[PDB]
Amino acid sequence: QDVDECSLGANPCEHAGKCINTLGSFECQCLQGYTGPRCEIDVNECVSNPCQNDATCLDQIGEFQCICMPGYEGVHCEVNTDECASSPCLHNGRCLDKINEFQCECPTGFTGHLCQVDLH
């Protein structure tokens, strides 16, 4: 004789998991982001510290999201944004990459941060 645990008053599977009856026991089909025999674990997607460079990790349902510290980008904030990519230095100035910052080394005779000032 078998008792259907799923048909009973309450659902033994936590977090809206699907209850599937078996002979002798029961099993839980968990939703994305939940684990355990009764879906009682909210999987920590931030447990392995996936966010890099002092970024903040958000433990979400079935996913993680990284809030990047200024100057960094990407899903894991792994990319140090190249501020020289957009070519900010006018009149062909040398660009030096920093954090959320660029450094223009202006040609002769220009100045100073974007090399826009013509000294004539």
Q: List the binding residues.
A: 22, 25, 42-43, 45, 59-60, 80-81, 83, 97-98
Nearest to 95 by CA among 84, 80, 86, 79: 84
One character per residue 39-78, x = contact with Na ion (rule: CB under 5 A): ----------------------------------------
24: left (phi over 0), alpha (psi -120 to 50) or beta: left
**Residue 10 φ/ψ, nearest 5 degrees:** -105, 155
Q: Which residues bind to Ca ion, rule: CB under 5 A?
A: 2, 21, 26, 42-43, 59, 80-81, 97
DSSP, residue by residue, 9-51: SS-SSSTTPEEEE-SSSEEEEPPTTEESTTS-EE--TTTT---
Nearer of residues 36 and 107 to Na ion, judged by Cβ: 107
Please identify which residue in 52, 53, 103, 116 interacts with Na ion, judged by CB under 5 A: 116
Q: Which residues bind to Cl ion, rule: CB under 5 A?
A: 65-66, 75, 112-113
| Beta carbons within 10 angstroms of residue 59's beta carbon | 14
* Cβ-proximal residue to Na ion, closest one: 114
Please identify which residue in 29, 75, 114, 120 interacts with Na ion, judged by CB under 5 A: 114
Residue 66 contact partner, candidates Ca ion, Na ion, Cl ion, none, CB within 5 to 8 A by sort of partner: Cl ion
CB of 84 to Na ion, least distance (A): 14
User: What does the binding site for Na ion look like in residue numbers (CB under 5 A)?
Assistant: 113-114, 116
